Structure 1
Amino acid sequence: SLEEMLTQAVQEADIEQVRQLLERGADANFQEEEWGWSPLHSAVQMDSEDLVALLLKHGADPCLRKRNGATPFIIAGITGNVRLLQLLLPNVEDVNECDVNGFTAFMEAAVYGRVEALRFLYENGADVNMHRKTKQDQERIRKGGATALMDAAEKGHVGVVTILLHAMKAEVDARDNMGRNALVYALLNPDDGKAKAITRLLLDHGADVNVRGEGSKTPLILAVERKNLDLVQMLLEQEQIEVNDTDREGKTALLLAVELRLEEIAKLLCHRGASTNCGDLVAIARRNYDSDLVKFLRLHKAGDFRPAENWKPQSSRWGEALKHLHRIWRPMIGKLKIFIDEEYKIADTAEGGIYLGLYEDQEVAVKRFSEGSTRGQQEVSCLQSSRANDNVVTFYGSESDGSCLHVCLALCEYTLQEHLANHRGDAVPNEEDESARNILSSLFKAIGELHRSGYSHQDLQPQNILIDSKNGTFLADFDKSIKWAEDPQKIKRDLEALGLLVLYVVKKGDISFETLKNQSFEEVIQGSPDEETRDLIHHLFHPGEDRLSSLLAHPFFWSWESRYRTLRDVGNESDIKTRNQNSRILQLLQPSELSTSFAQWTTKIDSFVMEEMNALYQDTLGDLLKFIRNLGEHINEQKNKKMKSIIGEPSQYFQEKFPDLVMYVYTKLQNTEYMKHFPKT
């Protein structure tokens, strides 16, 4: 509280209240633990000399480093009051002391365009062509090495540039670790006049003009991109200027000037040796509606330049249209290449449609929103949280053209509805449906993960589910999604739609989803072809917020083989074989319940099989399981060949003859020790 009242006192500039507390014994070398600021640092930054004098009297160290290694002296450079620098100098060890990023009081004077402070530190030993020496991590990626000249040029301080080159002997062609010099820094400044004046000075002193800036750009290309005839004339006054220099992507200064629709700057560039076979400049002027520059371009023809098409799309369905999109010219919206044409449309939506696009040269689906849209905001928000969810469509990023939020997504081959259509004629009519389990377990996982992330979908339907080239399934179209904390029992709608999607997929897409939405709970249950489906759906309409991942353990997701295996394994328990009425197993399998389909099972199994196996089977469940166990073990032996052919495939046999069997056993053993007989799930 003491030094804290001092800290406060200084911030207020109560000179007296400071005096009292210094005499009370308060530490002027106190530093707050976050950013390392001292009362001496603070007094300098706010520029009240009285406080700096008062604190220096009380032993406040002027070489005291804050978090960034800056000392109150360094800070005075930024402040630019000369009598502060006077007051701190007779305690300063080195005038060239740097913070951890290599900054000196002189650099700081240059950065803040403080002429008078620069003069003071000039006459006092301050090195003028000191490069910033930074920490090892910054150097290894070639950061640092900049100078007061480069600093002054970037900030556009005409005064400071004049004074350094002339009065102060600044090296004009000094390089930072990136290989940049003050000219590059000069050319980046937003103001026209300031940029003009600084470039002039620097050129006349012998700044190299053949230098690489950000994006491998020359000074010339920077002058072009800025649309400044003035900055381009100065740079084209020198002969050694490489006019046919290429930036990162192979764009030339001329190419750029045609592309930007800048007549004068293009012509001046031609009259100076900008070679014309760097791209079809004529066509570029033509799409620009630049009549005048066209003619001039055809008045220097060197024949008729030509352009090789390499890029192959990954998509099969969208391939040819993506080739076309890659071929034609479009302007970019950040990292996105897009064209609002029917040829490129994927689908129609509640706002804006979905089109093919290219994002960093990768194929994408692009969902469009009005940039103000609640709906677009909900989508982007949910997608940004879903990056770890493996069964959610991959999110590339979102780009704004100012009136339209573009959401870019991985491109998929088909919607679930399409996919089921294309694969409808693959399976023999009674085959086991492995495909349905895969699709639906991927959905359970996707929705389960979406819930754990705090989001609910609200519009699960088959058009929002996509299938990729490799048969994987993904969830999509988040516009109507909500953070479920807002209303926790709205999760229910996801769970109910998932129940409808169970039926949908098990029915191989033959029943439309519309139909299934107009049906009531009991109609849906009745529409189900088996008991596992019925029970699964039931559990979705009547849930217990991690129920979904537990439902992946449900016998619906057991293969026919696994189901058969579980019945055989249960039927091999000692107490089923010895018919121990005492035992815990037969206790559990013994209930109350309604009429089963295996009650008096012995009368509905072929009479030939019945005899051969009795070679004492009662109408208990226990004796059915045992029957399954023995038949499983012996079905393949020579002496059962006639039995084998009556049965056919045994898994199919038992499940068909007794549809409720697997479910009944699963229900009875679910939370018990003999749950260990279930497949590894």
Structure 2
Amino acid sequence: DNHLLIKAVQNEDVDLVQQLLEGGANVNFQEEEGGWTPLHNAVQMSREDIVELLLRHGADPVLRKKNGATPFILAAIAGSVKLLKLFLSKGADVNECDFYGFTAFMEAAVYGKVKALKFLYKRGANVNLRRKTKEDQERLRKGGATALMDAAEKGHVEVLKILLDEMGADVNACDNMGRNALIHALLSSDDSDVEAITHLLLDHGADVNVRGERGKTPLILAVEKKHLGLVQRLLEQEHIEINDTDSDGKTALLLAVELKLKKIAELLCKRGASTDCGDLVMTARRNYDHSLVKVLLSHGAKEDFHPPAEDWKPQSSHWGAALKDLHRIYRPMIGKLKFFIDEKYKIADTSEGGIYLGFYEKQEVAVKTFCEGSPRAQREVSCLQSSRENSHLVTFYGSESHRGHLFVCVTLCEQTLEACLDVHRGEDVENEEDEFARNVLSSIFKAVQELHLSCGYTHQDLQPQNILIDSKKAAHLADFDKSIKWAGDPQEVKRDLEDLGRLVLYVVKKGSISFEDLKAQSNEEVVQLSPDEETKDLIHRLFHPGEHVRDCLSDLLGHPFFWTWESRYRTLRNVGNESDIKTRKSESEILRLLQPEHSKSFDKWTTKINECVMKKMNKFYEKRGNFYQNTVGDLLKFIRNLGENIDEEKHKKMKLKIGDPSLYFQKTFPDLVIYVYTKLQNTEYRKHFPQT
């Protein structure tokens, strides 16, 4: 309803425009996006009749839009001398500029409007103004361009002749980047008139030895354009610096050779380019150009190139032998990525290619290949792009496309979970505490947690092959080409969770059971298959999360499974250290909680004990006859008591008969650690639990 007038002007519906304005429409309304008024639109369309009509209804002739452009400036873009004349009589100044420093003279040059350019010059426009813009952009070295530069960049030949021959434009003016008009023409993608423009500028004394945005000289730009005529004209300049190098340290000749340009490369050689630019001869051979090889040799090129003394050692131990080779051999670069699809550097075969060693930004990485369009390709990439903040995932370095082939670069690891615990299974013939199982599973839990909640994705392929191991040896989640977005559907989250539970049994059993048949048996057989009670209750919780399935992963990180043996020990002694349990009380809140489940390990625990240690502990209460009884409370009283004095110096006898105390109590009563946890799980008696 507020846009009616702007839209009427835009449709050039004069009758409707008249009707709206006479109806009471806001003539100076500004649309939110760019601050455009009906007048701005009328001028842009170069419709002087609509402009007049709007002005007579009280349109502000000098009202700027958001970029600071005036109707006068827009008139130059349109090329309307009539509208320029009009606004100059309405208070516009000929040298006024927008917030980016664009004057009307510049816009006429940009858009190639000759009549407007000529008119503005005679109305007193300044030809050699360098664009002044915000201090913001100026620190970037933005701004500083001129009208001559604009006409060059856009390739307006007639405008350029007029600027140089009739209007006294400074040919060698430079912007804040240091670019002159010659550089601007050669940088431009509008190549249509670049030959004429170049000759024109050079004949007017334009400087050939001036740098662009990447060390690029005019000569280097002509070489990269593969333009023989440009190179020929540029090389006629008696003082051109042929041996200048861009930001990559590459010279014009080297670039000519790499770009397979024999005629240009030979020309540079005849005009006296040095042949110590880099791998000159060997590059020509690799491109199978002996004609170019012979030319380079006669002009004195070196015959064995030893690259700069780059200090480099591979970080990987498993690879690295291969990495040293890949680092040494020649390879064409794909963007930032250097790699070779070859059996020597393949680490694994995959559905759309394989995984390969590579260097992403001089950094050693693993490279996953895809057919660029495939569903797998864009499931992996889409997931990796949305999960950069996930610390437990394999970190995403970047990707490169080549010819419909996607190369996803990713942190390089040593081996999979399978390969790792194959070795760990052969050495751990002991009944030893499995620290590795804990800090690997806790690491993977955090990956799936942030994946679901922070990244908003579901993995859908939790398996040992997809968990990679550092050289440290930390664990990381990987392979995402089977990921799905919205976790809203609980069946997808459930699918990931009951894959996690089957994975918990895998690591604890040290991989003796293959993951493929672990997925074959039900999630009820897998629970009954778990060795200790701590994993038994852990994977059971993963198969039956509470009302909020969301919270049910942070909670599990505080499960007895993740507790060390000393931690299980310390807290059992801490609960047994309750005053209500030593002075057994009927009304105790803690004692009624611990009361039962007919089948348990500790129902009559005083018989389960040795019991020569038992009688030696019972002697402490022989006076009042307060012996230990078969309650859950007195077992914890016993554990707190035993572990306390077992450090004193009259108890070496008890040390031998019990062995490690934290280990012994768990053996004879495996049911205990989980039982006390399930009970006190939501009480004030949780301070006894260890921190995380």
TM-score for both structures, normalised by structure 2: 0.95
Matching residue within 563, 567, 586 for 1:562: 567
Q: Which shows bigger deviation, 17-26 or 447-456?
A: 17-26
Structure 1 residue 246 displacement after superposition: 0.7
- Which residue matches 1:640? 651
SS in 1 for 2:211: coil
User: Are 2:672 and 1:677 aligned?
Assistant: no
Structure 1 residue 233 displacement after superposition: 0.3
Instruction: Write the letter of the residue equivalent to 2:503.
Output: L
- Which residue matches 2:467? 465
Q: Which shows bigger deviation, 436-445 or 333-342?
A: 333-342
CA–CA distance in 1 between the matches of 2:191 and 2:524? 75
Q: For residues 574-600 of structure 1, what are the alpha-carbon distances to aligned partners after superposition, in whole Å with 9 as ceiling and x for unaligned? A: 211121122111111112x23110000
- Which residue matches 2:624? none
- Which residue matches 1:516? 518
SS in 1 for 2:553: helix
Within a 5 Å distance, the mapping from 1:490-529 to structure 2 comes to 490-529=492-531
- Which residue matches 1:602? 606
Shift in CA distance, 96/657, structure 1 to aligned 2, threshold 3 Å: same
Instruction: Write the letter of the residue equivalent to 1:18.
Output: V
On the 8 A contact 1:345/1:356 being kept in 2, the answer is yes
Within a 5 Å distance, the mapping from 1:329-340 to structure 2 comes to 329-340=330-341
Gaps of 5+ in 2: 621-626
- Which residue matches 2:434? 433
- Which residue matches 2:294? 295
Q: For residues 51-96 of structure 1, what are the alpha-carbon distances to aligned partners after superposition, in whole Å with 9 as ceiling and x for unaligned? A: 1111222332222121111111111111112211121111234211
SS in 1 for 2:150: helix
Structure 1 residue 523 displacement after superposition: 3.8
On the 8 A contact 2:75/2:83 being kept in 1, the answer is yes
Q: For residues 130-156 of structure 1, what are the alpha-carbon distances to aligned partners after superposition, in whole Å with 9 as ceiling and x for unaligned? A: 111010110011111011111111111
Among all aligned residue pairs of Structure 1 and Structure 2, give the percentage whose two residues are the same amino acid.
72
Structure 1 residue 459 displacement after superposition: 0.9
Within a 5 Å distance, the mapping from 1:309-320 to structure 2 comes to 309-320=310-321
- Which residue matches 1:222? 221
SS in 2 for 1:254: helix
CA–CA distance in 1 between the matches of 2:558 and 2:301? 73
User: Are 2:115 and 1:116 aligned?
Assistant: yes
CA–CA distance in 2 between the matches of 1:208 and 1:312? 45
Q: For residues 453-501 of structure 1, what are the alpha-carbon distances to aligned partners after superposition, in whole Å with 9 as ceiling and x for unaligned? A: 2211111111111112232211111111111447431222211221121
- Which has the larger helix fraction? 1
SS in 2 for 1:278: coil
Instruction: Write the letter of the residue equivalent to 1:549.
Output: S
CA–CA distance in 2 between the matches of 1:191 and 1:25? 47
Within a 5 Å distance, the mapping from 1:348-427 to structure 2 comes to 348-424=349-425, 427=428
Structure 1 residue 311 displacement after superposition: 2.9
Q: For residues 386-409 of structure 1, what are the alpha-carbon distances to aligned partners after superposition, in whole Å with 9 as ceiling and x for unaligned? A: 100001111011211122011110
Q: For residues 230-277 of structure 1, what are the alpha-carbon distances to aligned partners after superposition, in whole Å with 9 as ceiling and x for unaligned? A: 110010001211111111111111111111111110111100111111
On the 8 A contact 1:395/1:410 being kept in 2, the answer is yes
SS in 2 for 1:348: strand
Shift in CA distance, 225/532, structure 1 to aligned 2, threshold 3 Å: same
Q: Which shows bigger deviation, 296-305 or 499-508?
A: 296-305
- Which residue matches 2:98? 99
On the 8 A contact 2:337/2:359 being kept in 1, the answer is yes
On the 8 A contact 1:154/1:186 being kept in 2, the answer is yes
Shift in CA distance, 644/302, structure 1 to aligned 2, threshold 3 Å: closer
On the 8 A contact 2:348/2:355 being kept in 1, the answer is yes
- Which residue matches 2:623? none
CA–CA distance in 1 between the matches of 2:19 and 2:514? 84
CA–CA distance in 1 between the matches of 2:499 and 2:280? 56
Structure 1 residue 24 displacement after superposition: 4.2
On the 8 A contact 1:53/1:87 being kept in 2, the answer is no
Instruction: Write the letter of the residue equivalent to 1:679.
Output: P
SS in 2 for 1:365: strand
Structure 1 residue 126 displacement after superposition: 1.2
- Which residue matches 2:323? 322
CA–CA distance in 2 between the matches of 1:18 and 1:364? 63
Q: Which shows bigger deviation, 94-103 or 299-308?
A: 299-308
SS in 2 for 1:240: coil
- Which residue matches 2:85? 86
SS in 1 for 2:311: coil
Structure 1 residue 223 displacement after superposition: 0.6
CA–CA distance in 1 between the matches of 2:8 and 2:92? 29
CA–CA distance in 2 between the matches of 1:468 and 1:433? 18
Q: For residues 611-654 of structure 1, what are the alpha-carbon distances to aligned partners after superposition, in whole Å with 9 as ceiling and x for unaligned? A: 12122211000111111111121111223332232112111111
Structure 1 residue 304 displacement after superposition: 3.8
CA–CA distance in 1 between the matches of 2:157 and 2:424? 72
Q: For residues 3-55 of structure 1, what are the alpha-carbon distances to aligned partners after superposition, in whole Å with 9 as ceiling and x for unaligned? A: 53322322232223333443444332222233211111121112221111112
Matching residue within 514, 539, 542 for 1:540: 542
Structure 1 residue 512 displacement after superposition: 2.5
Matching residue within 631, 636, 642 for 1:631: 642
Q: Which shows bigger deviation, 632-641 or 365-374?
A: 632-641
Q: For residues 549-574 of structure 1, what are the alpha-carbon distances to aligned partners after superposition, in whole Å with 9 as ceiling and x for unaligned? A: 21101110011111111111111112
On the 8 A contact 2:458/2:487 being kept in 1, the answer is no
Structure 1 residue 514 displacement after superposition: 2.7
SS in 2 for 1:215: coil
SS in 1 for 2:233: helix
Q: Which shows bigger deviation, 505-514 or 468-477?
A: 505-514
On the 8 A contact 2:269/2:296 being kept in 1, the answer is no
User: Are 2:632 and 1:621 aligned?
Assistant: yes
On the 8 A contact 1:484/1:491 being kept in 2, the answer is no
Within a 5 Å distance, the mapping from 1:194-213 to structure 2 comes to 194-213=193-212
- Which residue matches 2:482? 480
Instruction: Write the letter of the residue equivalent to 2:438.
Output: R
SS in 1 for 2:407: strand
Shift in CA distance, 34/378, structure 1 to aligned 2, threshold 3 Å: same
- Which residue matches 2:250? 251
Instruction: Write the letter of the residue equivalent to 2:651.
Output: N
CA–CA distance in 1 between the matches of 2:422 and 2:687? 39
CA–CA distance in 2 between the matches of 1:328 and 1:184? 36
CA–CA distance in 2 between the matches of 1:300 and 1:107? 47
Structure 1 residue 128 displacement after superposition: 1.0
SS in 1 for 2:449: helix
CA–CA distance in 1 between the matches of 2:378 and 2:477? 18
CA–CA distance in 2 between the matches of 1:667 and 1:10? 75
Structure 1 residue 282 displacement after superposition: 1.4
Instruction: Write the letter of the residue equivalent to 1:546.
Output: D
CA–CA distance in 1 between the matches of 2:294 and 2:64? 65
- Which residue matches 1:148? 147
On the 8 A contact 1:636/1:644 being kept in 2, the answer is no
Instruction: Write the letter of the residue equivalent to 1:187.
Output: L
SS in 2 for 1:478: coil
Shift in CA distance, 443/339, structure 1 to aligned 2, threshold 3 Å: same
- Which residue matches 1:73? 72
SS in 2 for 1:628: helix
- Which residue matches 1:662? 673
Q: Which shows bigger deviation, 624-633 or 504-513?
A: 504-513
SS in 1 for 2:399: strand
On the 8 A contact 1:503/1:528 being kept in 2, the answer is yes
CA–CA distance in 2 between the matches of 1:341 and 1:304? 28
On the 8 A contact 1:279/1:305 being kept in 2, the answer is no
Paired residues in the alignment total 679
